[PDB]
Each structure stands twice: as C-alpha cells, then as structure tokens.
Structure 1
Amino acid sequence: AQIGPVTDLHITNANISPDGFSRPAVLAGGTFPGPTIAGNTGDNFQITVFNDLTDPSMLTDTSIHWHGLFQKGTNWADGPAFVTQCPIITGQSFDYNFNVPGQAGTFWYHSHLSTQYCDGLRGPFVVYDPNDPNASLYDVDDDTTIITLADWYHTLAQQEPIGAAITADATLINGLGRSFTNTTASPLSVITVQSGKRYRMRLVSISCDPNYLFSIDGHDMTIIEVDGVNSQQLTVDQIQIFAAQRYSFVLNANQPVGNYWIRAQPNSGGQGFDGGINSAILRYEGATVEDPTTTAPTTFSNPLVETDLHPLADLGVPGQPFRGGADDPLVLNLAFANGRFSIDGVSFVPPTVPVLLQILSGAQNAQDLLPAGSVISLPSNSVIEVALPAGAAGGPHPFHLHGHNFAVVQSANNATPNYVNPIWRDTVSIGGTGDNVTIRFTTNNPGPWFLHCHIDWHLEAGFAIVFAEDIPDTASANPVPQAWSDLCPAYDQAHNI
C-alpha cells in the first residue's frame, strides 16, 4: 500500500538479503526500497520521520530529502544535512510538513546525510494529477507500475575502504536481483501486465552511482514524463537513466502472452545477464510461471537521446538565445584530484551550522557563509545560466539542483544548444570530455539550494556547492517551526559539539 500524504515513517536497522546475501541496512518503513509516499498535486504532506536507528556502522543520525519537490517557503523541510537542517538524532522524530503546489509527477525520497541512502534509505514519492493531461494514454497507474532501479553493495557505505574503487555487487529492480559475483538464483522481481492494457510505468533511478541502460525485450516505451515534467510522447526501445532521474513511459501490453526480460545494465559492476543478473521479469497474465527466453538485440533501434525530448507544455527557455544570455551567467569549473572533487577550486565539506540557520542568524552575504567559497549567492527574480563543462574523473556525472527544475539548454554529447524547446528536468548528465551541458532557471524560490553530483560517493568527496538564492528574503519566505529550531541544539548536544 501507498502511504501519505500524512504519515509516520520509521527509520530502522534490519537485516536484508535482496540478492541472497545478508547484510544490515537502514530502512524506511521496514523494506527496501521504502514504501511509496503518495498524494495529489497541491497536497499538504506531513511525514513524521521517526529515527529509530541504533547501529552506528551506518550512522544513527538521519535526515530525509524529498527529491525534486521545490519546497517553496519550506526550505527547512528540504532535508540536506548541514544545508537546511541538522540531522534528527536517534530516539527522536521530526515532521516534514510541506506542500506540493504546481508539481505532479514521479519523485523519490532518500537519506541526505553522508552516504546513508546507499545503506538503504530510498523509496518512491508520487504526486498524482487528478487532471493529468496524459491520463488518456494509459489504463493503469498505481503502485504496481512503479519500477525502481538500485545499486546494492555488500560492503557498508561507511566501511568502503579509503582509496579502493567502489562498485556495486547487484542491480536490484523493485528490490530484487542477483549478485554479480558468487551469483545465486535468488528471486527476481515480476512486473505483471494484462494483454491489451496500457500502463504508466514510473521508472525511478534510486541509484547511488551507476547509470542504467533500461529495456524490455519485445517492447518499446513511450516517454511521457521526465523528472516530473510532462513531455511530448517519445517512443524509444532503451533508456539510459542516470542516478536520481525519473521517466514515465507508456507500456502497451501488445506482445504475445508470455514472459519477457526486463534489463537494467549498469555502467559499472557486472556486465551482461549471465545467471539472471541485471534482470527482472515482465509477465503477462496467463503466462507460464517460468523465466523469459527472449534476447536483447545487438543494437537498439531507438535509444533515448535527451535532445529528442520536449515539454508537453509550452515551457520555452528563459533569457536570451545565446551563451551567457542570462541575468546571472555562470560557468562552473568542475574538477577532481587526489580523492576529492571541487567546484571553482573548493571541495565541499559540510559546515557545523546548517547554511539556512546561518542565514536566519543574520549572515547576509555569501562571503559570510560557511563553508567559505562553497556558497554562491543568486539574485532574486533573475534568469540564471549554469554551464557545467565535463572532464572530471568518474563521469558521466548527473548533476542535480534542489528547489528547482531547469531547462536543459545543452545536453551530453551534442555541442548544439537549444533555446527554443528543450526538456526541463532536475538531474542531468553533464556528459563527457569537451561537453558543455548547460542549464537555465529563474530565481523565484528564496533559500539555500544544494547543487551537486548525485553519485553519492562524489557528493561525499566534495562535488557540491550551495546556491544561496535571495539571501535577503530567505527568512521572511521560510518561517521555521519550533521543532526545526530544536534540531541543531539536540544534535550538537548529543555529539558534544
């Protein structure tokens, strides 16, 4: 069952064995992935998060981010530790009370403390539209049409050894899948469809790191939503989906009654499908209960290319139709060296006082904000452009901006900008060496918004900055509840800070 928009959510430690290997985890709602939190556009979400964590090997503090939700006027509820709050300590709870005006689509929630989400605190978050303009394109859209793609590690996130390469041990599709090494025939997830119906499949990458090449043997996929943004119909037979991205696609159950492989090939870890790794099962009602015997093509006929996507609505692009054609045009120098990432020469290290709290206490320029050099002010009511030239090791890097979606003026692997009708989204691959992925947005949401690589290992190693949007209005725009004010004193007390 879906929970919300008003719900408790307990965060606990437990053992799980999603690929047949048992390890402890950090779980929301007792499961991996966590339960789907859902409501309708404009709803008031009240998610009372109960921190019941006791195992320090995966951190007993926590903080949860509602990825893609703009949090306008509720920056305090956004979740990134030491940006908008101090963590919740064990044995305490915290009510994330916010509204979702003007948004409808497929989102997710995750720990936003250290690399804790990798240890399991990740789940879908769906905001339905009772007047969805795409409603007539499908018949079924419910918890059974959500498809999550996850990387899973046998080594605990905090215990990944300094200076050894981090790769996953299994791909999990809806929480199940098989280990790349010492593979056991553990159970695979089954997605069931009825011959003749049409499904809104909500494809969610809850990855900590790899991108996936996602496909369904014998089927194609009609994209209708990208990171919350309704798109024109785009039919593809493969989707390369980066960490934290989402797509809705229409699946037409128009093949013979049967079993078909669902494929999610990560860019690192196990390659191929031997023993059923990287796989799930699409099963039609009435099919024999047995594995698919289908094969992938050698070459996909219509892979997704980002520049092919366009908004369903007339969203345009703010500013002027050339490079630098914005009120605040930025170009970020994104680098990696010696185990640390940096943005304009500064490696992000979370501050002791959360950025929001520093602003509410009276720090009123970005030069006064800690960490020094990590907080960049943005002016209100302005068109911002942010070029994100690739080249830093560990790519392709999926950059994400909290508090906003953005026009993708320039996409990976294509040097041509689009100032007319590019897709809008909230996480974008910045591509490869010599690319110049560029985003635009307007500043109508006062508060400190994180900008970072959504490969969690890279965020932990410093690949982030904070956009202090409209410092002068942050306080008036974001009144804070007493419970939020209480977080830092309790955290600092428990940690002897």
Structure 2
Amino acid sequence: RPTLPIPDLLTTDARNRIQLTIGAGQSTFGGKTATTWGYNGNLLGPAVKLQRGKAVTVDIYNQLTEETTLHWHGLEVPGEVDGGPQGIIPPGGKRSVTLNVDQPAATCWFHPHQHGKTGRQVAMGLAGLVVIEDDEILKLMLPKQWGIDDVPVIVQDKKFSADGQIDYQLDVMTAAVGWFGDTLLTNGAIYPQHAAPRGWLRLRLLNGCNARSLNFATSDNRPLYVIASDGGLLPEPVKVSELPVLMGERFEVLVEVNDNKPFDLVTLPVSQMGMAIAPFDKPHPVMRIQPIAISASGALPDTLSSLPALPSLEGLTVRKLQLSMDPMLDMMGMQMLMEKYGDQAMAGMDFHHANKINGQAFDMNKPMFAAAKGQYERWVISGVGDMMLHPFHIHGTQFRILSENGKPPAAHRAGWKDTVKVEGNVSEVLVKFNHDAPKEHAYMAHCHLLEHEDTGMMLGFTV
C-alpha cells in the first residue's frame, strides 16, 4: 500500500505571510492519471497552522483559468475574509486576507465556495486544512508529532470515467441526492498505510466528500476516543465504537496502537440515499495502521477543556430556517437514482434553483436577515418534508447544538460545532457571531451537501 500522504504543515514566513497557490496538475489513481486541482500542489492542500491571537496574512494566488473563492470553514472571522461566494479571485489574480484567530484550538479546513460551482471545484481536488493552536491545548501532552502520531485523515469519494478523469456532473439526479462515487480516497490516496508508533495515535478526521456521510470504526473493534469536534476540544474524551461524520465535519480521535497488530480504519455502511451502493454496502477500508517502535509521548488526558454552560433560552431571538426541495426535483432525482442503481440505492431507507431555504433559492444580492452581534440566538432548522440528509453549516461561528434532528446531541457532538444534522426532522442550535459581515461580504448558512448548496439551499445573512 502507498504510505498515507501527509499535508505540509504550513506556517508564516519571515514576512508573517502564508502563500497559497491554486492550480491544476495531475494525479494518479489506480495507475490512471487524472487532471486534479490543488493548493500548493496537484491535489488537496497543505495544513495551514495558525496560533490563537496571532494575526497573519494569507496571499491567495488563483492560477486556474476560472474564478474561485477560498472559504475558511470553521473559522470565526469577519465576513470580509470569510471567502464566501462574494470573495471572488479572478483567474491569474491574487487576493490577500488577514486572519486574526480568536477561537480555541481546533482542526478547521478550507475549500472553494464559488457560486453554483462549489461541488465541482471540491470534486476536482481543492481542499486544505487549518490547524489552530492555543496555549491551552499544548499544555495537554496529546500526541503532537505531525505526520507521525498526529495525522490528518481527509476522506473523500470520487467517481472516474473510463479514461481515468474525474467524472463530475451537476444534473437533476445529483442536485437531488448529491455527487457520490465508488472510489474512496484518503489524503488523495487509495487505501494507504500509515506507520504509527506504539501508544496513542491521534487522527484528525475530515469528511471531505461532496455528499457522502461516513461512519468510522476499526477493523478489530478497538474503540475511538473522541477528543475534539469541529470547533475544538470536548471537555473530556468520549469513547465510541463507531463515529458518524457528516460532510464538512471534523473530529479528532485517539486510537490505541499495540505491537504485532496492524488494523484498519474503516467506514461503515450508512443509511443515506444512494450511499450504500457497492462497494459501500459493506465496511470499506480507509487506511491501514501499521504499528512501529519509535518515540511517542502522547497521552489521553482525563480532562481536556472547559466548555461554558448553555445560555438561558428565554429572551433569545429565534430564527426559523425551513429547508426544502422542489417536489419535482425530489421526485425526478429519486426516480433517476432508483432507475440507475435499483433497490440498493435506498438500502436503510429548472433544477438549478430547486433547492431552497424559507421558500427562496440562494440570492447572492439579498441577505435574508441581519443577525445580532455578540448575542446568542436560537436557530431552528427543519428538513421536514423530504428524506434527504442536510448537514447544515453556518459561517462565522462555532455553535452549540441544542437538539439534533429530534434528539439531544450525542456526547461527542455536544461541544463546539459548525455543522448540524437535519434529516426529515428539526434541529436547534445556539449561535453567536463575534465578527462583522456587511451585505457586500455576507455570511452564508447552507446545506453542506454541496450539490444542494449549488442548486439553491443557501442563504446569506449579515452581522
């Protein structure tokens, strides 16, 4: 097996700058070459390393021949640097942003957010990581050797055409159920191996799929200890036997590594339209972990961090967000899915503006509302009326889930999140915005099933 590719951990240079170049190159998948896009490379991207309270400048060079934007998913930053659909970087051009991180240590990530083209640009290869550090997390003595016992694991599916090229399409079927494929990539590689020292292995998991939800487990049923969610550390580790991860979500886990016993990280079949078609009808290997005997000091602390109590709900502004899909899209998309793949596609169960929030497909010129600044609000997001999975993402914030699709959140999902599951039921989140976002650079709130976002299921809001 190939070794697990390790993204460069990229810090500021002598001028306090970080350079990202967006460009097209070539990658090889199963011995077939494909045109791919990457940040500072042919595919995916580096891990940008930030320190809480230390402002840096990021220079972003777009060397594609089309427009793109660079969104920092999970970062609590002003709208002006948020890199949403309004943050256009011309082909051949450059945009610079100041990032002054004012949030706890976390694994965030970045990716394009081009209006109606986000699914395609991510599918082509564009994604990178953000590693935020603070004073607190370094005192913990977690596994911290980047690429050795602290490793990023970006998991993505793709589909390829016979000629080996990435086979992306935004059509009525994918607008309904998402773009998904039959080939699983792990930091861009197919079923790589990672050699990890005996002791604790820290995995920073990112579901970077367009539309496929994942569910991580180990091949020999050793548990995963969740230590962080989207927005950082949990108050204490949460032991799980399997770990569902929605599109765009991150979790950090520790897993035990003992000699003479390699094991796989796998993903388990999920109950999501279309996502259990072979080879995903059975547990699917993600990567092989090979124990080695080199230095490792990491530990699993009893206590990780301190999370504030939920604020009182009384008096809080309530914002209602009704997600919906045009009945025609729902009908025709599910029909095409069924026709193409048959019964297995439901195992466990103008389209360009057919997906909507509050009866409106995304209008970049009209933010739906102005949220308060520095005040908690309660946002209620409903997927009642269709059966699709909507990982709902809100820019500019790390929030607390109050209720997730009809139940209180699981322990490992009760900390800082920027995504919440909405699937045929209703979710509630407690959100606060610490930074400005004017109409010209509004925040987005949207489904992170990228084909839904690209066909309308997004709103803008100001702070």
TM range, smaller chain: 0.7 to 0.9
The equivalent residue for 1:238 is: 242
The equivalent residue for 1:68 is: 74
Equivalent of residue 125 in structure 2, options 111, 120, 123 = 120
Matched, 1:164 2:173: yes
Change (3 A) 1:383 1:282: same
- String of CA shifts for 1:402-424, please: whole Å, max 9, x gaps: 1101110001352x589xx9423
Shift in Å, 1:157: 8.2
- String of CA shifts for 1:140-195, please: whole Å, max 9, x gaps: 44234111111223268895152234322311112112xxxxxxxxxx31122122
Matched, 1:249 2:253: yes
Matched, 1:333 2:322: yes
Shift in Å, 1:276: 9.7
The equivalent residue for 2:348 is: none
Equivalent of residue 430 in structure 2, options 436, 440, 446 = 440
User: Which amino acid is 2:204 matched to?
Assistant: R
> Given that residues 210 and 266 in structure 1 are in contact (C-alpha distance below 8 angstroms), is that contact kept between their aligned partners in structure 2?
no
Indicate the SS of the match to 2:136: coil
Shift in Å, 1:19: 4.4
Indicate the SS of the match to 1:243: coil
Change (3 A) 1:90 1:390: same
Change (3 A) 1:62 1:191: same
Change (3 A) 1:235 1:450: same
Change (3 A) 1:344 1:223: same
Gapped regions of structure 1 (runs ≥ 5)? 55-59, 178-187, 288-309, 352-369, 470-497
Change (3 A) 1:317 1:278: same
- String of CA shifts for 1:35-65, please: whole Å, max 9, x gaps: 21113222323221111113xxxxx111111
The equivalent residue for 2:419 is: 427
> Given that residues 175 and 189 in structure 1 are in contact (C-alpha distance below 8 angstroms), is that contact kept between their aligned partners in structure 2?
no
Q: State the distance in 2 between where 1:75 and 1:440 align.
A: 20
User: Which amino acid is 2:153 matched to?
Assistant: I
Q: State the distance in 1 between where 2:166 and 2:436 align.
A: 33
Superposed CA RMSD in Å reads 2.8
Change (3 A) 1:409 1:244: same
Q: State the distance in 1 between where 2:386 and 2:27 align.
A: 33
Matched, 1:173 2:173: no
- String of CA shifts for 1:12-48, please: whole Å, max 9, x gaps: 1122223444322221111322121113222323221
Q: Give % identity.
A: 19
Change (3 A) 1:16 1:256: same
Deviates more, 1:141-150 or 1:127-136: 127-136
The equivalent residue for 1:154 is: 160
> Given that residues 44 and 98 in structure 1 are in contact (C-alpha distance below 8 angstroms), is that contact kept between their aligned partners in structure 2?
yes
The equivalent residue for 2:357 is: 343
The equivalent residue for 1:459 is: 453
Q: How does 1:409-424 map to 2 (within 5 A)?
A: 409-414=402-407, 416=408, 422-424=414-416
Q: Which structure: greater strand fraction?
A: 2
User: Which amino acid is 1:385 matched to?
Assistant: R
Q: State the distance in 2 between where 1:278 and 1:425 align.
A: 27
Matched, 1:8 2:26: no
User: Which amino acid is 2:417 matched to?
Assistant: R
The equivalent residue for 1:282 is: 289
Q: State the distance in 2 between where 1:221 and 1:417 align.
A: 18
Indicate the SS of the match to 2:173: coil
Q: How does 1:235-314 map to 2 (within 5 A)?
A: 235-253=239-257, 255-265=258-268, 267=270, 268=275, 270-272=277-279, 278-285=285-292, 312-314=305-307
User: Which amino acid is 2:232 matched to?
Assistant: V
Change (3 A) 1:311 1:277: closer
- Give me the TM-score of the superposition, normalised by structure 1: 0.73
Q: State the distance in 2 between where 1:328 and 1:273 align.
A: 42
The equivalent residue for 1:32 is: 43
> Given that residues 211 and 450 in structure 2 are in contact (C-alpha distance below 8 angstroms), is that contact kept between their aligned partners in structure 1?
yes
> Given that residues 70 and 404 in structure 1 are in contact (C-alpha distance below 8 angstroms), is that contact kept between their aligned partners in structure 2?
yes
Give the number of equivalent residue pairs. Answer: 394
User: Which amino acid is 2:436 matched to?
Assistant: P
Indicate the SS of the match to 2:11: coil
> Given that residues 36 and 42 in structure 2 are in contact (C-alpha distance below 8 angstroms), is that contact kept between their aligned partners in structure 1?
no
> Given that residues 2 and 143 in structure 1 are in contact (C-alpha distance below 8 angstroms), is that contact kept between their aligned partners in structure 2?
no
Shift in Å, 1:277: 5.3
Shift in Å, 1:234: 0.4
Indicate the SS of the match to 1:91: coil
Q: State the distance in 2 between where 1:78 and 1:132 align.
A: 25
Q: State the distance in 2 between where 1:40 and 1:463 align.
A: 33
Larger Rg, first or second structure (1 or 2): 1
Matched, 1:135 2:104: no
User: Which amino acid is 1:257 matched to?
Assistant: N
Gapped regions of structure 2 (runs ≥ 5)? 1-7, 295-302, 330-350
Equivalent of residue 396 in structure 2, options 389, 403, 417 = 403
Indicate the SS of the match to 1:63: coil
Change (3 A) 1:80 1:443: closer
User: Which amino acid is 1:319 matched to?
Assistant: S
User: Which amino acid is 1:403 matched to?
Assistant: G
> Given that residues 21 and 154 in structure 1 are in contact (C-alpha distance below 8 angstroms), is that contact kept between their aligned partners in structure 2?
no
Indicate the SS of the match to 1:458: helix
Q: State the distance in 1 between where 2:38 and 2:208 align.
A: 14
> Given that residues 73 and 395 in structure 2 are in contact (C-alpha distance below 8 angstroms), is that contact kept between their aligned partners in structure 1?
yes
The equivalent residue for 2:59 is: 48
The equivalent residue for 2:298 is: none
> Given that residues 76 and 103 in structure 2 are in contact (C-alpha distance below 8 angstroms), is that contact kept between their aligned partners in structure 1?
no
Indicate the SS of the match to 2:56: strand
- String of CA shifts for 1:348-374, please: whole Å, max 9, x gaps: 14x3xxxxxxxxxxxxxxxxxx23xx5
User: Which amino acid is 2:384 matched to?
Assistant: G
Q: State the distance in 2 between where 1:150 and 1:417 align.
A: 25
Indicate the SS of the match to 2:137: coil
The equivalent residue for 1:479 is: none
> Given that residues 32 and 123 in structure 1 are in contact (C-alpha distance below 8 angstroms), is that contact kept between their aligned partners in structure 2?
no
Indicate the SS of the match to 1:385: strand
Indicate the SS of the match to 1:439: strand
The equivalent residue for 2:111 is: 110
